[PDB]
Symmetry: D2
Subunit: 519 residues, 4 copies
């Protein structure tokens, strides 16, 4: 009762649950919410990556809006060197997924005075000309600004608003020309090179998948990435385009659709159906739609992803102040906790890990907050509603999954151990949101990496050879999971755990649930 | 379409009621045990075979009447009838034997030396109660003998005395040292050897008499499955019954009958000391006001469901069927609502012991219970049973609740449970699944006693234990499969839940298709 | 301690059951109306006075038998007994008069043992009407062949005998359940869409007599469809426009078409006797619970009828099944419970009334209002009606302060009816100057109607206050509450129906 | 159903509710959650204050940690000049409250010689201006009684960390150490007085200046509240005391503090130094929950829109934080440096207004109302029964408002605790009640300046009609719509007992 918020867990109402939340009730060891870290100059070394893994990084995200293939290939090599440095003991080895985040249909400005790091300070109530004349693509300054959206003039009008750099610089269109726009600075500030531009009024007509995106996706297949985070998905056909480009060689790569504009929110259901998962890409979303509405979009998408059993990621500015400071703001601590309470499978760090001064501290803080928030979930109602809203099916795997989760609550189990080839069995357990960690034992390295997308899954990669006698191969993997849970302090000899197995080899036959004491 | 599954999906109890559908037929399985009192209408081997076919699960013998010789004969006939079906193990049905004690009864004497004679008592008339044994076979409209020698010490002027299922009422006007003078309040026909109640009084008869001791020891000798202990007032009464059964009868289940005010008052300590409870509504509704009996019934069923201990609803459920071939609408309602309340078993007394329509009464209880079981709001029931049940480190409990959850998810045709002691099946039953629980056991007493639990359909496996443990499990599971298919519970391609141990502790749940 | 308030506080239904306490006494007020069939056992002015004292709220007259002069005399005695208490308006209890129609019937002719397995021809040929026997059975329902099919079952004599149709002016049948057949016996056709008229020629005469006699409500027999209700309404006409029509659901078609029937009616009777001939007896409880639930959801009165205390025709105490049946009808949500032979002809009519009173009061305290009120609200539409919002506000306030009563001024009854649908624990004292409103209010659970006979005060607000004060006196006199208790009072902003909009929480003076 | 998240409102489950939240379902005009703005150089001018009011400020917060009485007196004067500049039109006039936030008890280090291991903490007043990397003086004489070996000590808003008439410590997290820096003792029972000498003078000043409420710093126990109440005295008896919970002891003794107080502030800045920052959300949600359960106002404070000190738009974490405070149940939300010192004070106020209004529409009132009632005690109190009846009626007929006549505010507070969707228009003739009412979610206070009518019934009607006019002018409702109206059976406080459903004229 006095740990894991178990007193609050037993409340008969949500209000009383809130009233019983206890800062002196410490959480379990296991942290269920996956942490996605963007890798860049601050976190790209093998040395730092080892520490990022030890601090809780589950997925390395590469943002292809920046950097050459050479650069990203080296980052990927370093991630794998760091990750495989722990491979000698499979009991302690932590799989690490690699994610390719596409540029997509972005608009960006040019170079301020010929340099990538130069800046000019735009005073408010000034005049600024936007041009498409490539003569100025590297000669941006206080007076003239080039950007790379050739067809911009057709989709904007006088009075249209144009936003630059995370929506912070604000411009109003006064006149239009053949290949320019004369604007007045509505909100000023420093203007740097190659900054993101948004046209919230307008229907931007760029390709769902550009030539650059084709190149990058090919690279992703060549580099054996686990997942693609696809930028600016507006409709199911965009998802299908990425899927078709990845083609047969990339058929097992998971597609996470990033929702970052009004159309994506409107067509969310068809996007979700077509996708392997979703990212709430709050950065651009909060520029494209009023910032005060983002929380509605966030909770709608997390809700709908939870109902569908598909992974959802909360992204962007979660611990933003930690780019410059060792500790986060109170709003940031709140945001991370509330993303977990909403139901997000994963949470993400961008500049905080890619470029900031405290990457390890940012990972460590997400880890601490997620674990406290996981204990604070009102499982009583959540599990009731998930059961009630679930399609009724004669599928034996689904019945075993729900039985296992019910059982896990009844005996407050230290874990649910699941043997899985493709991950699907463990995903089915995760969809019902147990408190207990799900130890997913697999021999498939890609399954192990991809499983990090799901709340609660702790993937472990068995490297023991296959035993002649299948039943004894099954027991070998179960015992492996016992060794892992024990070594990582999830449970100890005599605790009770749940174990899911199947009746024959191959995927699709999980049907056996056992409640067993830890050896 | 069937099994009231539309009502089952309602998000409120009110909408669940609104969706109950007379054109939604129930499953073949009937979960609520039917206990039948055996008497001259139902004692022959020939008639017992039909009682079994009609749905009887437990034969009740009332030791308020009959010699040991006679009851040994009844028990032999029940076993002969039951074992006549043993030659096909798939269709054999276990039948339990229950001994119902006389206990601290008060009875009148014989009207004019006759067992059948009656006299009319008129409202306002005088009637003298005597303890002088010279009148024990000479009762009439003037003088009534009864067998409670200490009656004068526990009543006073103004006390009310009830005779014959509380239908005749008297008021004490004068107390003598060995007699009472009373006025008839509610008159009627007074017959021989009728039951007497003193609702105001603290009756001082032994919880367990010399005769009860003899009858209980006879029960042990005769290998009865359970004892229905009459007039239990407190835990120490239960302890006295348990003591008499002793080590030899330690596995005999003791069902305490609650039929007086003190029993209701002390219910919790009685329940703790017992293996289950009977709501003995006949005497209860004389000892307390009749309008309060439904409160006591619902309280006791609720408390038994909370504790996971069997509870029996008894007495007058189909009373009119003693004389008529069909029940009244109140009787149909009563049987249905007993099941909705949560009763593990329902019972028939005169309807099967002495009436004109014993088979029809068993058949009617069968038909009503099956309809009522479909009409249960499992959504709320299961939620409350889980909430109110303790979460503990017991693996069998967790496997049980998991099995019930899984059965709801895939709407399984059964939960098959391999069990030696019955415990695993009892643990599943306490969570009230919709699916029938086919309990496969090699232990005959387990199979018989399992009828006390809602939803358990016990099947007795007679095959020898196979060499390989996996093969012996498969043998028993396939036996349950063959029974379920023969009884129409399910068919090839349906999904069932199977509970077994993992190695040679029930801790393994499999979701398997019916072959 | 009292009124099962420990059980009331339980967070689950299961724990609510566990706390039900036979030593927790109920309040004085009994909310469920008791309808008593009047006949030879109960027809005298002197017995009717005791019937009223014992708890009768509605006197039911069964027009299946008896002449108009006979029933006129019964009605006269009811009114004589009822008005013997009129001198004290504080203690006067209104008593309603209900006319229960004979309705459409199928009968056999004049005649023998029907054996299982034997064949019996049913003839519509009038030649055999006084010549019925083991081989040819005449019936008076000319269209029988149109509504039955090969395989259809036909019941005869209250379901005693069962026949199955084998060939279809005639029908060749096989006897499924046999027995002694007599003359002029009742016939039922399970599952058939019977096309007999909504009202018989006799019914039309009886309904018109009901209007003459100023009855409060009609219990319309054998209602199968909304159009049947519309025909009864037509017969009662403009003169009978305020008489309530309670549709009796008695067969499969009535259950199947329940929603349209309910919409067109003022209320419903679950007519369990004939329903359990027409459908399997073991299914009647499902039909009862469905109809009670649906009436509760619509806020329309529902009556549970037939055999509730049957054994009390001959014995002074009921069976245990009978006690349970009455308590469960109340727990299900029945607005009224009914007695037929028990009061019409039995040896213990006053005891039968008293027992229904005692059980109903116990069962009312045992209701799980926490869940019941929560559900009624969720299922209660948002509307712009002020009376509806005032009514739900009043019931919520009544729970919050465990009020002694909800007092409602009403002309038509409607404002009180709107409170009743939310099922407060507190009694609803409905104060009216309309005598018919006062009588008809007995149809609704929780309403205790009181008839104010005081003159209209010259300032309308003072006239409102006078009626509220009358209700305070009624509550104190009847021991519903005492000086200092808190009560809820409902009134409106101007005179006339339809303006109830004011809820006050007030001390009993 | 297309407005006010009404589709999501009708969901039978909370998951389905979330799934139906719709960025294209516009909110109503009303915004229920009070906005408390800290005043400072960025927002202290009469002209800027007028714009702060128009942008949505309900409470002006004065932080007495700095500034002279003369300075703060001028700020209050400017607040009142700005507020009364709208008083000509009483239908559109918005009351604005004045809050005094105390400096409170503090532990401070001494004067350096900045110094950049071992470290002695000394209470020797000889070392009080000779602070350096070897010796650190503190002004808390009793520190040695409240700390033990292993106890942590934080210096300068938590920047520097140490593990322990003297203390010997090992620097855990190093940094530049200046002079006169704040010290925190995580887990320690600091026995500093409830009220400092400065606080006593400041609280007297608050009474003289007619402030509406005091935010009392560093409240650890009920007795601290009682001391503040005692200092305010009979002259200050109607000033609301909001206890700031800033440390572990305050969280542990929360129930007794709440009982003694008029309301609570979750002072998250200092709280996240005193306890691990990852646990602050637990303390926030617990305190909001218990305040909602007690029907007492709770304020969410500190860094809600922190990035807006420097930028015109907040971060996505900041938008989320504000929304989630409102969904948690907070009656008010606060701005500190965002409005006191920042570059975008008006934008910060406007953003809290926008987010709060969206969040109020997204509340799952179906379960919220069901639960508030279940936890609602059955009592004999008529006004409580009237309040819950009014809220139930407002849900049943989707009323445009609940109008409440109130002298002290209490009748309107009683409605607010049940969290109606409809705005609560609290009509009062008491100017202080009108200001204080902003502490309660849902209350839109209106100050009636019509002359008292001789016939009390007419005077009651006049005030109800005033509310009707406010609601029509503000777009809450229109002629023919139905609203709920609460009144009492006689003049004076304590007699609210009448709920009417009334058409808007």
């Amino acid at each position: 009762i006095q740990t894991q918020q178990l007193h609050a867990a037993m409340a008969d109402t949500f209000l009383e649950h809130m009233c019983r939340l206890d800062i002196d009730s410490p959480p379990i060891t296991a942290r269920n919410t996956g942490i996605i870290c963007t890798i860049g100059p601050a976190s790209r070394s093998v040395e730092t990556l080892k520490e990022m893994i030890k601090s809780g990084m589950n997925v390395a995200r590469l943002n292809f809006s920046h950097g050459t293939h050479e650069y990203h290939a080296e980052t990927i090599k370093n991630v794998r060197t760091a990750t495989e440095s722990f491979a000698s003991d499979p009991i302690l080895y932590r799989p690490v997924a690699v994610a390719l985040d596409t540029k997509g249909p972005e608009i960006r400005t040019g170079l301020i005075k010929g340099s990538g790091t130069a800046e000019v300070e735009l005073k408010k109530g000034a005049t600024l000309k936007i041009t498409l004349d490539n003569a100025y693509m590297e000669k941006c300054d206080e007076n003239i600004l080039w950007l790379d959206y050739k067809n911009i003039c057709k989709v904007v009008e006088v009075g249209s608003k144009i936003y630059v750099d995370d929506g912070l610089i604000s411009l109003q269109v006064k006149q239009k020309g053949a290949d320019f726009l004369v604007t007045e600075v509505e909100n000023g500030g420093s203007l740097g090179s190659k900054k993101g531009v948004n046209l919230p009024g307008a229907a931007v007509d760029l390709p769902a998948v550009s030539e650059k995106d084709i190149q990058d996706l090919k690279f992703g297949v060549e580099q054996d990435v686990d997942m693609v985070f696809a930028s600016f998905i507006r409709k199911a056909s965009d998802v299908h385009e990425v899927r078709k480009v990845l083609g047969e060689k990339g058929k097992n790569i998971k597609i996470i659709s990033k929702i970052e504009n009004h159309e994506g929110v409107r067509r969310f259901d068809e996007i979700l159906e077509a996708s392997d998962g979703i990212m709430v890409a709050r950065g651009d979303l909060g520029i494209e739609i009023p910032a005060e509405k983002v929380f509605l979009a966030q909770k709608m998408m997390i809700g709908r992803c939870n109902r569908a059993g598909k992974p959802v990621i909360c992204a962007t500015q979660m611990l933003e102040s930690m780019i410059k400071k060792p500790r986060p703001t109170r709003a940031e601590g709140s945001d991370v906790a509330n993303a977990v309470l909403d139901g997000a499978d994963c949470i993400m760090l961008s500049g905080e890990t890619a470029k900031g001064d405290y990457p390890l501290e940012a990972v460590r803080m997400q880890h601490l907050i997620a674990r406290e928030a996981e204990a604070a979930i009102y499982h009583l109602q959540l599990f009731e509603e998930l059961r009630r809203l679930a399609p009724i099916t004669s599928d034996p795997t689904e019945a075993t999954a729900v039985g296992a989760v019910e059982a896990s609550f009844k005996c407050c189990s230290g874990a649910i151990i699941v043997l899985t080839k493709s991950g699907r069995s463990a995903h089915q357990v995760a969809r019902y949101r147990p408190r207990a960690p799900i130890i997913a034992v697999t021999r498939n390295p890609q399954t192990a990496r991809q499983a990090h997308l799901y709340r609660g899954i702790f993937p472990v990669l068995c490297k023991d050879p296959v035993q002649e006698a299948w039943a004894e191969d099954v027991d070998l993997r179960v015992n492996f999971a016992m060794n892992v849970g024990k070594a990582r302090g999830f449970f100890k000899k005599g605790d009770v755990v749940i174990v899911l197995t199947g009746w024959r080899p191959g995927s699709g036959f999980t049907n056996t649930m056992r409640v067993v004491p830890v050896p």
